[PDB]
Each structure stands twice: as C-alpha cells, then as structure tokens.
Subunit: 247 residues, 4 copies
C-alpha cells in the first residue's frame, strides 16, 4: 500500500550483519527501500549482500575512519543516488566501573558510539538538505537516559547522541530533514544470549514487560521514524524498553 | 501485509467526528481494525458511521458520565467483543490566565481531559488483562510537557495524563497491555484555522519544521503504537511536534 | 549572613504539623522568614504555633474549601503583609490498583493534591506580581515522574502539579515570581514508618543511596528554591530521591 | 551557622579565573571550603590565588593532559588532604553549523567538555569512596538538554556529561558520593557581553525571566549541591535558565 512505503528511498544502515542492525536493514527493504548495510569486514559485507539480495547490498565500513566513510558513500551515491535514510547502529561496549576504566576504553566508546554519528551524519546531510528530504535515525540505548553502573562511557556516548540529535534537528528541520533517536532497552541478541541465568533474571526484574525485546521491535520503531508519516517527529527519543524506564 | 496489521482488533476512539480523532479512526480502520468512534451527539455519531461504513460505527458518548460510558461499552462488547485498543482523544480547552480562570474552567478541564482517562481506561482494562493483550493510547499535548501561559488547567490535565499512563503501564505491563501517550504539537485543525495570522505566525516561529502538523501525522503515530510491533513500548510519551519541544 | 536569607519574607506552608511540612516550616523560620504553617485542625494549628514561637504561627486550613482559603489568607495579610513564599505541601494518598480504585479515591486525590495548588496559587499570585517578587514551591513526588503501580491517582495529580508549574512559570516569570516543584523520593515519615520490613527493604532495593531521605533534606531543597539566590530557577522540578530516578 | 557549611571540605573548581568558575570558587570559600581553583596559565592561577587569599589557591591545570591532572592533584593532596568536592567547570565552545564543523572542532569539544570529566572524576573518586563522602558537580548547559543549532558538538558533550553523571551516581551512591550537574541557561559573562544588541535581545526573547543569569546564581546552585544538606540528591540535572527550558 501507500502506508509507510519507502520505495524510492536509499537507506544506509551501519552495523547491519546481525541482531538489531540486520532487523532494521531487512525491514526497511521489506518496506521498499534500497538498503546498503555495513559491517567491519568483507565477510560480514557479503553476508549482508546475501540476505538483502536484489533489495540492496553489503559494504565494508570502518565508522572511525574518514577515508572508509568517504569511499563507502561515493560507491553508494554512484550506484543508487544520495542517501535518503541514515541509520547509525554501529556501536560497541567497553564496560568497567570507573576506577577500572582505561583511557582507551573511554576513548574507543566516544569514537565509535558518538564521534561516528558526527562523521556519518555530516557525510550525508548535504544531499538531504538540497533535496529538502531526509531521515537520520540513531540507535541509542536506555542506558543513555537511565545511566548504568559499570557503563559510564557507554551512557555518556549514548546521551551525547541525544544532544547531537536535538541540535541537528533544530539545524535542519526547516529543510525537511528529521533527526531522531531510537533507544532500545534489553533486547535479545548474541550478547544477551551469552549472559548467565542470574544476570538475565536480574535484568528482567527491572523490565515490567517481564521479557526481553526482539530486534524486530527496534526495527519497527526505526522504519516508523524513517517513513513519510513521521515527518513531524524530530529531535525525539523513542524509547522501546518494556517499561524499564519512563520519561 | 502482516506489517502493522490490526485485523481482529476492536478499537474505541473517543472524540472522532473531526480532525485528529477522525484521522485516527480512519487510519485504524484502514489498517484493519473494527473501529467504534464516538461523538457527544447522535448527529456526530451518524457522521462517524458514515465515514467508517463497514469498518465500524459511531456512537454517542459522554466521557464525563459513567452511565453513558457503561452503555456505550456494553453495546460494543455485545456486537464486536472486548475492546483491544482504546484511544482517549476526547478533550476540550478553557483557556485563561490564572487570575481570570474560573473554578468551573479548571474543574471542567480536569473532568474532561484527565478524569475521563481514568474512567474509560478502567472500563476497558479487565478484558485486556484477561486476554493478555491490549493498547491504551492517550492523545496528550506538547503543552503537558512544555507548559503554556494561559493554559495552566490544560497543561495540568495533560501532564496528569502522563503520570496516569506511567503508573498504569507499570501496573499492567506483565499482562501484555501497553499504555502510552501521543503528544501533538501545533496541528492544523478547526481551532487553529480560527486563529488570526499574527497568532499562527507567532506559534510557527517556535516550530523548527515551520509548518503545522497534519491530523494524519498524529494518526500515524497512534496507529504505530496500536500495532503488534509496538508491544515493547509502554509508559512512553511520543512527541509529534515538528521540533517545538525536545525531551 | 546575607546568604539564603529570608528575613522580610512571609511564607505560607500548608500541611505543616509533621514530617516534611514541619521540616520546611522550621527551616524557613531558621533562615529568617515569618512562617504561617497550616493544619486541618485547631489542635494541629496550635502544635504549629508551639514549634514556631515568635517566628510565625499555625492556622487551620481546609485546602479543598475556598472559604477556608479566603479566611486564612485575609488573616495572614492583615497581620504580616502579603505572602512572598507559598509552599504547597498538603496532600494525601488513596492507593489502589485501578480496577479497585473508587470514583471518590480518584476525585479526592485530584481535589487535594492538584486542584488545591490551583486555588492556593491563585489566591497568592496577585500580590507577588504587583511586588514583582515571589516564590511558589510545590512539594510533588518521584511518583509523578516515575509512575507507580497502585498509585495511578497520586501519580496523575503529582504529574499534573508539574504541568501547572511550568505553565504558571511562563505566565509570571517576567514579573519576578518563580514557580518550581520539589519531588521527594522515599522519605522517612510516619507513613513509611508504618510499612513492614519487607515493604521497606523492597523499596530501598530501588534507591542507590540505600537509605530513606530525611524530611530535613526536603526542607533544604525547598529553602534553597525559596531563597533570593534561586531567582533564575523556574519551571523546574528538583528531584531529591537518592537516585531512585534520574531525569 | 551549621547551615550549608563547608568547613573541613577541600574543593577543586576547574576553570575558575573568571565568570561562573570564579563565582563558584568564591562562594565555596565563603561557605568555609578550602578551595583550589584552576586556570590554563600561571597568570590565571596567580589571579586565583589573589582572590582566594587564605581560603585556598590557584593552580595551573590542563584538563586534557593526564600528566597535568596527576601533578595538580598530588600537590592538593599533599597540602590539603583529599578532594571532597570537585566542580568540573573548565569548558570551551567551537561553534559551527554541521556542514562547516571541522574534525578538530568536534574532537576538541569532546576532549575538553566531556573526556575531561571522565579523567578528573576518576582522579578524585577513590578517596571520596574510601571516606564514604564526596561531591562531584559538573557545570553543564541548557544546550545539552535543549539542543541548539550551530552547537551540535557542544550539545553532544554537555548531554554526554549527563549520561556520565547518571551512571557514576548509580555506581557510587551507596558509598555516600553524589554526582550531579548544574545546567546554566544564558548567564552574563564576557562571552555574552561581546554579543551585539540584536543577538542578546534575540536570546532574551527565549527567556521568560526577561534577563540573563548572574554567575553568582550558578554558584549558589553549585554550593547548594556541594552541601551536606544535598546528600539525597544524586544523578540530577539542576536547571538554572530563567525558564528558557522546562523539563
Ligand atoms: Cl484536547
Ligand atoms: Cl502528598
């Protein structure tokens, strides 16, 4: 139908070889977008090409490297036209209580989870503004809003993503580009699957929904914000956390 | 498709004869819901039946009257089965600076815009909890979060809707019922159409989007939250305001 | 010293016979304010006069009765001059899960915890605006921001206090009147003392501070906002909850 | 008196040669703290020693240099004992619309306004935790919460400060260390004094207070949070913005 239809849009989803990033890339494709998903290695890139088939392709992308960013985008633009939707999902954790937290654990989190957004957003914004149409959607975290012990770095970067989102939203609203954040809670992934029973039960104790989120549930919120129907939403943080936190 | 498909769901949308409430009712019907929209009068009810056709019907409902509430719901339940989706959109304004604000202008706002949500939510929750499935979505306002001079009553009620929403979200999350608020900014409606040029330009000065939202844009955010895909969103306030405010 | 000095200010503190309200009244008096504290009965009023001594007095006040409000304020104004600082602390609970919550338990909460703030604020604002100086400080609750199961009425009223506060803050900021909310978490009081061990330990599990707050800690936050030094704080909600919730 | 008395506390205030940082250092001293204020150069350090006199001293501190941080703290600890209060006020701006924003303008803001907090907090936390007593207070900005066009970097760092604050607050609450942010709005400083009439009037148009803040008003909020009386406040953002934004 004409409802949340992304035919004619070109979407770039970073960190799309598995879990949330994969779900996003698949759902945007299913809604009609041409999707370029990225991974850190070529084998991941290939896995992305494999699941996307005729709806898009996989590329190798180092989100902390300007040269990689410039090369990946040139290839997209050459083949598909300018990016209409950017989903910043690439991200890592380097957990530790502050007194154990290395300089590199802090800086790597800042570079990968916050500075990347600045670089990638900057690389796509010009075309979006000239076309008077765009979506930038950042995959944040409940931890950005809630805070969490042992994750001061991750929390700082993810909260930073929101300050960036709000400022960019103001900057580009009049030109028809929205900028928003989706903030997952505890979503079932490989990382959460590796947790032991105690750890999972403990975390479930803080989720009124009494279960973990599915990656497809984050994907749905992303495709919603990516849609023409979400044009009047900007500078927003959409929380998908089973009631873990309520703002 | 299977995406945001509301076939099999029964939706009750209050205050549905025009604008936002109408847009909501029409979109939920288009996504497959059986929709009962309400109005204060039988002529409004009929206009509702007229636009819904085979997808639902209009009923006369006084949201400040328990007897009306009981009668409308009995009729729905008899014909359609229990309500799966409640959208509380009925609401009014009684604007005045505090020193001019009558006792009745305060109390009418509280009754219509806040106590109604208590009554209607209570009237539908039992079946939702037994079925282990439900959506309650309140149409709030940016004013509830931002505040606005000359609207301390409206702001209080709309902010009250959020405290109610969070508490109910916690109460019923484990039973698969979500409770959320959609908070419109400045949406083009009859009320906003009656504003003079100065007033509209002044208000647009505070919207980075530089336009009024469309009622359909509010409808889309409600339909999204009403969908199966939104099962992991609860206790949330979804702002649809063109950047007027950013939380 | 000249620091947070309230000499020359007249403060009205509702619900001041014990706990938080008493602590507030005693601290404002200690910082130099002439303090009128209220209670529902004459015996409470007397207990208030007894602890205030030469720094103020107790009066009987029914916050849900306009006639009582008019009479108490006339007395204050006659003796002391216009009220410079209003602290709305009077409030009650009527807890129940929604399906057990009586019409009267909802309406009594709305009247006592929200409509009271409308009435009392309205009754003091005119003199504050003419003098181009004033403080209105509402004692809210973490529950207004967080939500809580079994307290949807209380949450709604306390969240309503914030919408009212923001709107009034906008209405009167240019005239040198601030309007703010102090939002206590779990504070040691008679109510919390009556809780059993299980209930207290369960609630302490959600407080990172690992203790209940003291009424004096709420008093200090109110005295701070009441001070000249706080002239540039308005429309704000000051959370004093030991980390129970973080916004 | 015994009210907000900081006798026996050792306070480190970064960026204290002028404006807000100076006001903070002076007020903490006035409330009885031994204060070490810092500046980037020795001449600033000397100016700080000059205004502090017998209440403390100035030191040269490069907040983006671990070696400088280690040397300044050793000297404090040697002379005064462990730091009890840390105020992170050192900060810069590197404004530009995103498309004009250099890599270095982004990174310098991240390093100076966010990574510094991680380094300085880490350098002081151990002693605070062993003593079971501490205050870390970060001077943020309304722009962290509101966003602002042309300041996406500043907004991101200042929002990042909050995510860090909330996480650290959780980490150390049980050990009697609070962590909080004070978020100034438009405060009169050299930077705001250099603005032209149009720019100032434009910005005042967004402040309901209808004036700029004074540095002493930020200082008051800082000394309040630094006090024993604020022990039950942690993970909070205290907004001092004349109503410019209302959360
Ligand atoms: Cl309404
Ligand atoms: Cl209360």
């Amino acid at each position: 139908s004409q409802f949340m239809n992304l035919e004619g849009k070109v979407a770039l989803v970073t960190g799309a070889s598995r879990g949330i990033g994969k779900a996003i890339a698949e759902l945007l494709a299913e809604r009609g977008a041409k999707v370029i998903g990225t991974a850190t290695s070529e084998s991941g890139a290939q896995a992305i090409s494999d699941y996307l088939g005729d709806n898009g392709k996989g590329m190798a992308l180092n989100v902390t490297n300007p040269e990689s960013i410039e090369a990946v985008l040139k290839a997209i633009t050459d083949e598909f036209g300018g990016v209409d939707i950017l989903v910043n999902n690439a991200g890592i954790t380097r957990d530790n209580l502050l007194m154990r937290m290395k300089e590199e654990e802090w800086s790597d989190i800042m570079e990968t989870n916050l500075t990347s957004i600045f670089r990638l957003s900057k690389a796509v914004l010009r075309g979006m503004m000239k076309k008077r149409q765009g979506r930038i959607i950042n995959v944040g975290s409940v931890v950005g809003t809630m805070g969490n012990a042992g994750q001061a770095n991750y929390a700082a970067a993810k909260a930073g993503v929101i300050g960036f989102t709000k400022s960019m939203a103001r900057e580009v609203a009049s030109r028809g580009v929205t900028v928003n954040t989706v903030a997952p809670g505890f979503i079932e992934t490989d990382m959460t699957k590796a947790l032991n029973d105690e750890q999972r039960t403990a975390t479930l104790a803080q989720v009124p929904a009494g279960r973990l989120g599915d990656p497809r549930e984050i994907a749905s919120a992303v495709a919603f914000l990516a849609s023409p129907e979400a044009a009047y939403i900007t500078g927003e943080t959409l929380h998908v956390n089973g009631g873990m936190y309520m703002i």
